[PDB]
Design a protein around this ligand. Structure first.
Ligand SMILES: O=P(O)(O)OC[C@H]1O[C@](O)(CO)[C@@H](O)[C@@H]1O
Ligand SMILES: O=P(O)(O)OC[C@H]1O[C@](O)(CO)[C@@H](O)[C@@H]1O
Lengths: 191, 191
């Protein structure tokens, strides 16, 4: 049976600082996760695994530790926060108080100044989903907002639930599409 | 009429590092705010004023920039996050996934392991509001969660609105209580 493995890049430097977006590299234990992922994947004994990543350094660097070849997709790049790129939440509240308030109102269609909305994100992920459907075993190393969009599709979630789906770091979600829907398994790689 | 000025401690070290809770000191620009605050209060042309703070260093240090005495209330201490104290959101999502998700569904009543809920904070602040109601001009230098509870009372907000009320840093809220309701003026001190 085919299984789709979904996970995020290992812990980035900006993740450690509590800052959003950007294009930073993996931290120390972020790299230890890349190694732990390589171990888990091997132990899965998956037949002909296709591996996808984004153009962002953090995803690429995580895939490198696997040894096997992978492919890069621009459409898998993290959601653009626009002007709020690399800010902490406190900084967004202080410098864009009205914008921050509008988000909680409708997290699905809200756009930061010159940024993307979850709706924009779902649109550019359409082709990524179409390919995913016509594949067998695949591992997608992406980002939190991207993972939420892909996960919503497979676990059949609404536009309301989507922006709030649980997608923590160092955790792999093994989704097995079945006739009644989709089975899920969560594997936490403690590093 | 008299006015109640509500604001937070200047930007702290943990605020800058994207971490919550703790007992950290003011950052460089966090101190600039403490001085910019003194200048704002000065320009108000107030004859007598009571300044209250919590036991947290960040609030105390901010009061120190005024050059006037102040009273310290334990009741004005920021909400306790328990085991999640001094952690980032990503950190909390990873190591306490279930806990994190449960908070989102009921932000008002939820308590982190060994922590407080917004409901507890509201109860803890009862004697503070009572005094605030029987005083003249007062300046309360407190915290984000504490500030939201106080602001909710004066502006008549429901427990559903309370946890999401806007309370950014370096922003003074001048409240003027009247017959019914309360007047509000938002003053931002750019530093
Ligand atoms: O605010 P949330 O719920 O993290 O939504 C998506 C977010 O993903 C992030 O990568 C969070 O680290 C941000 O860049 C983006 O705003
Ligand atoms: O973080 P929230 O959910 O907006 O609530 C107020 C928060 O203020 C903090 O100081 C940091 O966000 C936390 O201690 C507290 O939970």
């Amino acid at each position: 049976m085919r299984s789709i493995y979904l996970c995020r890049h290992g812990e980035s430097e900006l993740n450690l600082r509590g800052r959003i977006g950007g294009d930073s590299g993996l931290s120390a234990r972020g790299k230890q996760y890349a190694y732990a992922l390589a171990n888990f994947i091997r132990s899965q004994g998956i037949s002909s695994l296709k591996v996808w990543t984004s153009h962002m350094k953090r995803t690429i660097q995580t895939a490198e530790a696997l040894g096997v070849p992978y492919e890069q997709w621009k459409a898998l790049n993290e959601i653009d926060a626009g002007v709020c790129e690399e800010m902490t939440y406190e900084e967004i509240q202080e410098h864009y108080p009205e914008e921050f308030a509008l988000r909680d109102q409708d997290k699905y269609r809200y756009r930061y100044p010159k940024g993307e909305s979850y709706e924009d994100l779902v649109q550019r992920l359409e082709p990524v989903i179409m390919e995913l459907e016509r594949q067998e075993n695949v591992l997608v190393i992406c980002h939190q907002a991207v993972m939420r969009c892909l996960l919503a599709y497979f676990l059949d979630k609404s536009s309301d639930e989507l922006p709030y789906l649980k997608c923590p770091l160092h955790t792999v979600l093994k989704l097995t599409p079945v006739a009644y829907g989709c089975r899920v398994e969560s594997i936490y790689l403690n590093v």
